Amino acid sequence: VTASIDLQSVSYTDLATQLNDVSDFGKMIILKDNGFNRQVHVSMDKRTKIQLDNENVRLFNGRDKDSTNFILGDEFAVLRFYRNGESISYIAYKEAQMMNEIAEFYAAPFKKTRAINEKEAFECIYDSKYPVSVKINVDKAKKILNLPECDYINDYIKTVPSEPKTVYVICLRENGSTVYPNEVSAQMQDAANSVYAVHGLKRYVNLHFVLYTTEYACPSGNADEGLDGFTASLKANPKAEGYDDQIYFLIRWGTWDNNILGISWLNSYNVNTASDFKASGMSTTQLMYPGVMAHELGHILGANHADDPKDLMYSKYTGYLFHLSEKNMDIIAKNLGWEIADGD
Amino acid sequence: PVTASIDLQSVSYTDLATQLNDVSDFGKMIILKDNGFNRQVHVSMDKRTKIQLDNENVRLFNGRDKDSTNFILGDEFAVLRFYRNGESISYIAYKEAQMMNEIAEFYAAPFKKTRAINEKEAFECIYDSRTGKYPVSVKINVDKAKKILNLPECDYINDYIKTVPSEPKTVYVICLRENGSTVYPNEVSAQMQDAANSVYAVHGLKRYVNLHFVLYTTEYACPSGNADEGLDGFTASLKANPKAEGYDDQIYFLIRWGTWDNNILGISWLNSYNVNTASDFKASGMSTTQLMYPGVMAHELGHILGANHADDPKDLMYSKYTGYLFHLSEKNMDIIAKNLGWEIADGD
Ligand SMILES: COc1cc(=O)n(C)c2c(OC[C@@H](O)C(C)(C)O)cccc12
Ligand SMILES: COc1cc(=O)n(C)c2c(OC[C@@H](O)C(C)(C)O)cccc12
Ligand code: PRO
Ligand code: PRO
Numbered sequence: 108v109t110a111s112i113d114l115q116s117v118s119y120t121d122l123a124t125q126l127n128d129v130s131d132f133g134k135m136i137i138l139k140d141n142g143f144n145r146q147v148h149v150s151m152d153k154r155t156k157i158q159l160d161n162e163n164v165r166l167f168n169g170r171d172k173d174s175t176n177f178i179l180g181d182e183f184a185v186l187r188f189y190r191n192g193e194s195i196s197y198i199a200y201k202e203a204q205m206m207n208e209i210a211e212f213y214a215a216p217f218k219k220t221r222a223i224n225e226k227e228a229f230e231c232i233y234d235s236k237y238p239v240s241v242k243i244n245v246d247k248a249k250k251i252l253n254l255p256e257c258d259y260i261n262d263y264i265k266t267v268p269s270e271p272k273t274v275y276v277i278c279l280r281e282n283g284s285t286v287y288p289n290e291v292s293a294q295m296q297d298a299a300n301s302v303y304a305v306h307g308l309k310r311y312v313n314l315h316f317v318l319y320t321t322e323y324a325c326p327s328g329n330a331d332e333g334l335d336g337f338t339a340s341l342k343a344n345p346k347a348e349g350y351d352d353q354i355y356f357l358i359r360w361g362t363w364d365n366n367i368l369g370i371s372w373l374n375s376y377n378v379n380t381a382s383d384f385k386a387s388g389m390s391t392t393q394l395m396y397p398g399v400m401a402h403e404l405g406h407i408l409g410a411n412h413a414d415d416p417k418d419l420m421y422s423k424y425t426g427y428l429f430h431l432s433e434k435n436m437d438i439i440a441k442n443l444g445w446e447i448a449d450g451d
Numbered sequence: 452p453v454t455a456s457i458d459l460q461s462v463s464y465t466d467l468a469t470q471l472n473d474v475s476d477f478g479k480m481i482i483l484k485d486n487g488f489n490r491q492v493h494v495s496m497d498k499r500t501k502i503q504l505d506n507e508n509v510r511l512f513n514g515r516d517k518d519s520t521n522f523i524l525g526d527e528f529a530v531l532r533f534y535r536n537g538e539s540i541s542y543i544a545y546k547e548a549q550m551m552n553e554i555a556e557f558y559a560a561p562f563k564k565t566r567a568i569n570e571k572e573a574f575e576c577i578y579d580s581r582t583g584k585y586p587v588s589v590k591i592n593v594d595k596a597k598k599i600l601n602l603p604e605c606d607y608i609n610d611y612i613k614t615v616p617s618e619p620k621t622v623y624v625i626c627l628r629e630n631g632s633t634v635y636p637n638e639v640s641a642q643m644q645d646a647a648n649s650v651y652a653v654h655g656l657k658r659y660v661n662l663h664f665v666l667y668t669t670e671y672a673c674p675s676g677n678a679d680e681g682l683d684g685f686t687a688s689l690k691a692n693p694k695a696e697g698y699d700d701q702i703y704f705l706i707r708w709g710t711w712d713n714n715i716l717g718i719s720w721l722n723s724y725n726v727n728t729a730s731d732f733k734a735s736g737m738s739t740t741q742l743m744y745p746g747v748m749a750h751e752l753g754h755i756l757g758a759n760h761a762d763d764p765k766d767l768m769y770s771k772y773t774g775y776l777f778h779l780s781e782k783n784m785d786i787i788a789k790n791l792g793w794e795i796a797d798g799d
């Protein structure tokens with residue numbers, strides 16, 4: 108009997124038991140949903156490392172055709188897959204108090220209004236009572252909640268190895284900000300996978316995300332002023348001494364003035380010349396805006412805004428998570444040590 | 452390029468986690484330093500063994516054979532254990548201040564009655580270099596600690612009851628915290644690591660098996676202090692447990708902190724696990740997990756895999772408890788490896 112996950116009752120223990128059994132060779136897992144099943148071949152993601160306040164977070168992938176990824180920490184697990192182009196997440200926290208808190212947090216925006224189609228956008232999942240997970244379709248949720256259109260308008264400021272190079276992405280929880288591990292990890296996973304999908308870049312780089320708290324807080328709602336202050340705080344921080352050549356993000360749950368989702372120094376990271384904390388940006392981590400860190404990481408690696416409305420780098424926020432621009436893909440890969448003669 | 456280092460005069464959980472979390476597929480050089488001590492170790496992730504303790508993921512790390520160094524890393528704790536001049540030294544660091552304080556008090560308590568003059572070489576609370584008030588880790592030299600403490604002689608006398616693949620076979624080692632028992636994650640994981648490494652060191656057995664340890668609580672408690680009666684009841688509790696249905700072919704340990712009557716450290720069903728015939732929860736045993744008796748789970752796992760008591764006093768399978776963690780008996784090594792699918796023609 109093939110291993111399975113029942114999406115009508117999926118808990119943290121269910122996801123952890125299955126994902127912890129994934130060996131080097133991968134594992135078939137059936138996702139079961141109202142009598143319809145999806146067989147996914149799950150593998151450990153060996154390219155990316157993540158710590159959130161030193162808590163280890165592991166990533167898992169399906170095959171490209173499976174359009175499925177997982178996240179696993181000691182405290183939470185995530186299953187994220189697509190249906191009719193929409194992003195559906197199952198988020199399960201291990202501790203009952205935290206699972207109850209998370210369920211209330213995600214349910215609260217929907218309680219203000221009373222949608223007739225609320226369950227397809229948001230649903231508390233119970234064991235076959237307190238919730239064991241939540242199901243959120245962020246595309247459907249954004250249509251019900253009628254959120255202000257947060258975009259990427261002026262979200263940037265201008266200024267073959269045998270072993271991939273490790274590049275740390277040092278994320279710093281802004282002073283006074285509260286972020287949720289499932290949300291931060293999802294941004295990190297989408298950011299890393301947007302890079303590996305380009306020109307076989309896992310041969311050149313392995314991204315290592317870490318999360319700490321910083322004393323820095325943006326002095327205003329302005330993203331440009333905030334990024335200026337953030338990069339200045341890194342240069343003056345004794346804790347960052349010796350790491351001026353890594354990538355940095357100031358993260359928060361919310362957004363900046365003019366519904367700016369994030370901002371970064373354009374074309375500020377190159378594997379040979381990285382220095383002076385230039386490769387820095389800021390990003391929201393809220394669930395309803397997947398791919399913001401990926402978009403900002405794209406700018407740091409040199410990607411400009413793209414003309415295809417399905418591109419991660421489109422000037423408007425779309426929810427698409429991959430680079431489609433060949434010009435951007437070449438710029439990003441060249442900044443990470445790739446050359447055309449190396450192929451994909 | 453400055454080699455990474457661990458300062459054993461101030462080593463904390465954060466120190467060990469940041470170093471071990473930086474270990475890639477290719478390994479990492481780390482210098483262990485202390486007053487009058489240095490060791491350059493090439494650290495690698497242990498990809499053979501998986502561990503969850505109540506679903507908390509625990510990762511193992513190895514040095515080269517000549518480094519005599521291993522590490523354990525969980526979200527809540529980290530361990531560095533190395534051998535120096537024939538003695539086993541562990542640095543145990545818990546992330547949370549409350550738990551680190553509790554752990555430091557727990558390890559210090561046996562020494563507070565026997566106030567030895569040479570206490571620091573056996574046990575020491577380690578503090579941070581800039582502040583320290585509360586300990587960031589504890590150093591325990593088990594061999595020196597056993598000479599200071601008047602511990603009763605705990606042994607293995609009658610601790611056994613006589614009842615190449617391309618991908619290694621996964622074998623779960625399902626450990627169950629006995630009802631009413633309190634165990635510490637650094638202690639349980641050290642027993643698991645030593646047990647797994649005693650198997651892989653024999654006939655290149657990582658080609659045949661990858662051990663996956665899990666820890667849960669059981670409602671079972673031994674009805675008395677008798678290890679034989681305890682093991683009988685434990686194997687019976689597995690056969691009657693609905694949670695274990697479908698897993699009768701895995702390996703099981705009932706674990707506790709303490710020992711059984713007659714200072715018995717553990718017990719197991721001899722020659723009860725074979726990769727082709729494993730069934731009926733036969734591959735089961737019991738093991739202490741206390742820090743001062745490293746290798747008990749390894750010794751009991753040896754018996755489950757068919758190893759008999761060996762005559763070399765340096766063998767893991769010697770009938771007396773020694774603290775040695777490897778099989779030396781060629782007869783035992785062949786029995787264990789054959790029970791895991793190995794054949795002489797396969798080589799090492
Ligand atoms: C507020 O900034 C930081 C806060 C903080 O706590 N730390 C530790 C920082 C930091 O350390 C990462 C470092 O240990 C590596 C990359 C080796 O894993 C580097 C840069 C910044 C910080
Ligand atoms: C008290 O015994 C048990 C308690 C308990 O909670 N569980 C889950 C047990 C169990 O499951 C292991 C299982 O999830 C696998 C091997 C897939 O990882 C097997 C055998 C026993 C137990
Ligand atoms: O995953 C589990 O088993 C529990 C159920 C609710 C909260 N977490
Ligand atoms: O459903 C849709 O159209 C959007 C586009 C990308 C993510 N989902």
Ligand SMILES: [Cl-]
Nearest residue numbers: 212213216394
């Ligand atoms: Cl929300």
Ligand SMILES: [Cl-]
Nearest residue numbers: 320321322323
């Ligand atoms: Cl800071």
Ligand SMILES: [Cl-]
Nearest residue numbers: 668669670671
């Ligand atoms: Cl039970």
Ligand SMILES: [Zn+2]
Nearest residue numbers: 259262263406
């Ligand atoms: Zn942009």
Ligand SMILES: [Zn+2]
Nearest residue numbers: 607610611750
């Ligand atoms: Zn024995």
